[PDB]
Amino acid sequence: QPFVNLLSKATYWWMNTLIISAHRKPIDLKAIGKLPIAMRAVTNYVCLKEAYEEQKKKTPSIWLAMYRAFGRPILLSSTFRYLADLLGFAGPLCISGIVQRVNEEFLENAHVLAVLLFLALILQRTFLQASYYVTIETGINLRGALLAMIYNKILRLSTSNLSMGEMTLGQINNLVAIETNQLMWFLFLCPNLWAMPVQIIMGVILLYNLLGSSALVGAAVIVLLAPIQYFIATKLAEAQKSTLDYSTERLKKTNEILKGIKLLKLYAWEHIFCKSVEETRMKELSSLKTFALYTSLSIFMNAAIPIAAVLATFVTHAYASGNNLKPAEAFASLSLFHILVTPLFLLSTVVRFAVKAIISVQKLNEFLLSDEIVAIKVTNGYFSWGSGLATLSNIDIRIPTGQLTMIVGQVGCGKSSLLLAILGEMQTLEGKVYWNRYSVAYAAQKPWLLNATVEENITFGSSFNRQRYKAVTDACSLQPDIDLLPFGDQTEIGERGINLSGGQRQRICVARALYQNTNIVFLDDPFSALDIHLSDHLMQEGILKFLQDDKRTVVLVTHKLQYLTHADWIIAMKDGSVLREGTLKDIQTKDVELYEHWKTLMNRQWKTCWWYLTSGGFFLLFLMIFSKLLKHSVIVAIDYWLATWTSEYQTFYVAGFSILCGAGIFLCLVTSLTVEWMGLTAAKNLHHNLLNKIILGPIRFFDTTPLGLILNRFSADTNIIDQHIPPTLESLTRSTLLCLSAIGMISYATPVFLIALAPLGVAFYFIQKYFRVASKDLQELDDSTQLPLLCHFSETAEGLTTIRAFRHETRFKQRMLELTDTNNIAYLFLSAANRWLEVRTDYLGACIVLTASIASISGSSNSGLVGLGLLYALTITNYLNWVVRNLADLEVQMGAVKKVNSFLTMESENYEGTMDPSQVPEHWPQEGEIKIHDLCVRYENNLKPVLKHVKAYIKPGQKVGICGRTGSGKSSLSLAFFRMVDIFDGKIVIDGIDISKLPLHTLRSRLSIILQDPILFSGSIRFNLDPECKCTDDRLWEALEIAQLKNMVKSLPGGLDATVTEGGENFSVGQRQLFCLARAFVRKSSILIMDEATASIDMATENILQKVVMTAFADRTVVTIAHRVSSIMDAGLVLVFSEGILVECDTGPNLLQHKNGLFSTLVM
Ligand SMILES: CCOc1cc(CC(=O)N[C@@H](CC(C)C)c2ccccc2N2CCCCC2)ccc1C(=O)O
Ligand SMILES: Nc1ncnc2c1ncn2[C@@H]1O[C@H](COP(=O)(O)OP(=O)(O)OP(=O)(O)O)[C@@H](O)[C@H]1O
Ligand SMILES: Nc1ncnc2c1ncn2[C@@H]1O[C@H](COP(=O)(O)OP(=O)(O)O)[C@@H](O)[C@H]1O
Ligand SMILES: [Mg+2]
Ligand SMILES: [Mg+2]
């Protein structure tokens, strides 16, 4: 009975059910059983950690610890691998014996030898496939522990700027994605280092015995394949490494277009800004050409050399040896080269991965050495962010139990430092910290949000309590902003989630601390980017009413001393030293100056598959498929030619043999180049069009579509097409022809074999049909679960302070251990499913050999031909698997092309204008007059007009003001000028021309608009002044001085051509608004649209805008939508829009004069 269990483990019958289930229902984690504790990340991490700690007892070596953990399984796998190679060598020996016994006793009989071959091949591949699976179990178990192990370091890292920085996040994000995968892949290929070289030595050893001194000449050439393959391998790495480099920043430029896409389209240089991506795109391809050529060359040397090896052998033996070639010798030896081609060709891969693994392990072992770390009573505190210099000195604070212990100080002054020191985030060189450590609900000063729901973010692993959630939402005033969110409390936020504003981001985290039921809180300047009212609102209810009900301690570091009276305690610290400790009563009496000085500052106020091929052009598609037929035609004839030559058992046969191999070598070059030459042309045309369609795409699409999904087309899907399809498409065509031809050639040698084909074809089709859908679905799971694992590691890296603060370590560790477990299963059952296919094609493959062996014995053909059929029988079993696995890989990759093709045909905005271009003369908007005729404006095809029946004549040069109710038709009207929102009815006429009846790009260009938050794109300031570059350089300097920025610019390096960070990082927010004004003047628009211009702008900077607008654009007409409606008091023409209706339309003073209308209530 236990033989049944051994067999079932040996042929992966256990996977079979799942495979069949894939047809009935998609395979999913529910359908896949839970991973055994023998392979869960917990046990693997414990084993590896125990080995590593024993090593640390003996710096410890990662390599030796990994061996001590995972040695026995790879020893077993290598034993299986040897037993597989030795039985694989039965192939040539059995073929030689058969051919000798045929053509005229227990072992000599061909039948007994034929059956022996059938048992050998079955046993060879049962062993060989099992040997692969053991390493995969070992390899995955290794990746299981490492991801757990390096994660333990992340929670124990230190956030000091010295030990952690922007460079640090590069390693950890890359270590999980790359360093471990390279280390895992090495383990998959670990046996080969001592398996393939043993086979190579044996293969040559047999060759000499088969032929004589001739085979060495052929063996010598074949040996040279491996050094060639390594030299080609290195050149691929440099070609690919450069290729990734251009691709990496090409995505960065892609992100800039896709984020803030409206901004580019408004200024009409969406086309021009796109071409900046094409410039890098051509360089990306210029790396690919060097890569594609070398990949084709690697294919060439994989085929041209063995054919040159045989040509070197048989020609040699025809002269060095008096004996004419015998049929048994030829096809025994000729088979052996096919046995040796794969290990010689792939040996460059295993050694290269050995180099990569040793690179990563050294990289990963450097990682581990990275630096690792009265409610609150601290006396004589001395804290330092490393650097051997106490960043905090003379620290002595007391935080009374269950009271608001607020801290006051100036810029710097150890503001955030004091809190983190209590949390163990920095070294305390002296003193002692007494939590008189409980869980501390610290709030990060910076905004760090998980890629999950707001409710999860506020609960943060706490049991839901809507009444407790109610007060938190009310006290932190999270209720109103929630209504705006798509899925409410189930709105996923963060980098993966919806992009928020700074003020709303801060309140979410603060709410978390109130949610957590702990005696201690550390609220770090929540009002950093908040309105004063909400902070006052929080100080009344959230700070006092909510917390005092819980009677928990609060330590709120504050900069406005107006709330110190509310504070039960005040802590004054400056220069990293505590100025004085005491309440407001104690501080004023003891430190009279502090009371006045603070108050002084307080006073201060598969049809796609065919579609993909045709992309290059019919000739390129024809040439590839036409030539590949010819290559096999010559190759097969070469194998046949030996049958004609060896049937003799001699300058004729050799002569015809050299030329054939000459064409075979040459045709190998042609069929190698044509496939890749298709790939680049197929790669270029697909991506080239795609960027155009997105740019012309409607703005409404970008609002609907998540930003993560759109960029995925250019990041992953385009990567698949460019680099993965041409390799797979090459191997599929090569493997199919070999399988199609070999079955043909065997059948031609033994026509009786065709009767035996009827069942075998049926069996192959069912395995081909069923596995494809089972591998495709598992493939989706492997990618699906891999991505959140990387997201978790990046999320835990950022803001470890909170994780250490809340004592959320263990819960977060558990999340990772389960997250990786869901990922290993997907990859493990992807490899086990793939193994199931390989076993059941060899069990099928052995049947082809067995039928070919038995049929050939019965046939009385030429002794060479019966040998030839057996040769292809052995080759079939090798390639009959890759015709399925590559096809599955091709089918999945055709998914990317299907997605791209949809985007290509999905949508466009109508850039063409019906009226002739001659209609618009030079400087059309010069007049500046605006005319609105019964306008109706709604972006969504079926929706109410956001602007309805709008009509208000605008005089030329009139600083018209438009305002109303918050969220009631104010900004929509702005884009209505820019036609971004379709004017379903009515019309807008500017200077006697309806804006609808004009080319779209003309309308966008000749206008000037300023959004609420200006954004500056990567490049020079000249790039941000005129991407079109048409404007002469003289004007560019004028605008900055007009914008009052030229003086600031001159200090910057490079003068006018000064590099600018993407997104306006270099310039301050106030400075950012200055950049737009520079763009405003150059256009000579005569129309300015300042929608929410003063919004998100400091009052000091705001005065400049009013100074600039009244002066710089006096002749221009400024249609202002003010953040503060008071600025429209002096507007000569003022429009009020409520519910999409012109509720008030008169002069500013006349608005108060006519009646206490909407504007009058708006201001007052
Ligand atoms: C675990 C993922 O990877 C594997 C890994 C293995 C273990 C393994 O030494 N393979 C040999 C193949 C045989 C022909 C030697 C090999 C060696 C060097 C380079 C690649 C490969 N192979 C692996 C990558 C695909 C190309 C051939 C088996 C099977 C697989 C697999 O596909 O599932
Ligand atoms: N995590 C850290 N790593 C290294 N240096 C730090 C760290 N936190 C603070 N410092 C340094 O300690 C000093 C005082 O920082 P402090 O805690 O007062 O900041 P802050 O006033 O809260 O900051 P900000 O208001 O700019 O956000 C500064 O020199 C600062 O660079
Ligand atoms: N992307 C969107 N999709 C659907 N409706 C929106 C979208 N953005 C805004 N709205 C709604 O349309 C109105 C537009 O208001 P608007 O006139 O643009 O002034 P503001 O921009 O100051 O809200 C808002 O009340 C809002 O509720
Ligand atoms: Mg700070
Ligand atoms: Mg608005």
From Swiss-Prot:
Matches recorded under SMART domains: AAA
Pfam families: ABC_membrane, ABC_tran
The species this protein was found in: Rattus norvegicus (Rat)
Cytoplasmic side: 1-78, 131-182, 236-290, 352-617, 674-745, 885-1164
Stated name of the protein: ATP-binding cassette sub-family C member 9
Gene (name only): Abcc9
Annotated positions binding ATP 2: 964-971
Complex and partners: Interacts with KCNJ11. Interacts with KCNJ8.
InterPro entries xrefs: AAA+_ATPase (IPR003593), ABC1_TM_dom (IPR011527), ABC1_TM_sf (IPR036640), ABC_transporter-like_ATP-bd (IPR003439), ABC_transporter-like_CS (IPR017871), ABC_transporter_C-like (IPR050173), ABCC8/9 (IPR000388), ABCC9 (IPR001475)
